[PDB]
UniProtKB/Swiss-Prot annotation:
Natural source organism: Hordeum vulgare (Barley)
Protein family (similarity comment): Belongs to the protease inhibitor I13 (potato type I serine protease inhibitor) family.
Keywords attached to this entry: Protease inhibitor, Serine protease inhibitor
Annotated site location: Reactive bond: M40, E41
GO molecular function, one term: serine-type endopeptidase inhibitor activity
UniProt key word Membrane: no
Protein name in UniProt: Subtilisin-chymotrypsin inhibitor-2A
One BP term from GO: response to wounding
Biological role stated in the UniProt entry: Inhibits both subtilisin and chymotrypsin.
Bridged cysteine pairs (disulfide): none
């Protein structure tokens, strides 16, 4: 189980989702502005995409 996609930093949401869904077809993908405060709960189904103001991936996407 691959759980992180560092190679997607700087990519658009559209591009990132295409790669993630190949690896984890039933992923629950949520998009949030980078810096958003989140809780510590671990959700194995989820992959949060933290984006910058240009709508590009700003932090390494990971399961959780």
């Amino acid at each position: 189980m691959k759980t992180e996609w560092p190679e997607l930093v700087g990519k658009s949401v559209a591009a990132a989702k295409k790669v993630i869904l190949q690896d984890k077809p039933e992923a629950q993908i949520i998009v949030l502005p980078v810096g958003t405060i989140v809780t510590m709960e671990y959700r194995i189904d989820r992959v949060r995409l933290f984006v910058d103001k240009l709508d590009n991936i700003a932090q390494v996407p990971r399961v959780g």
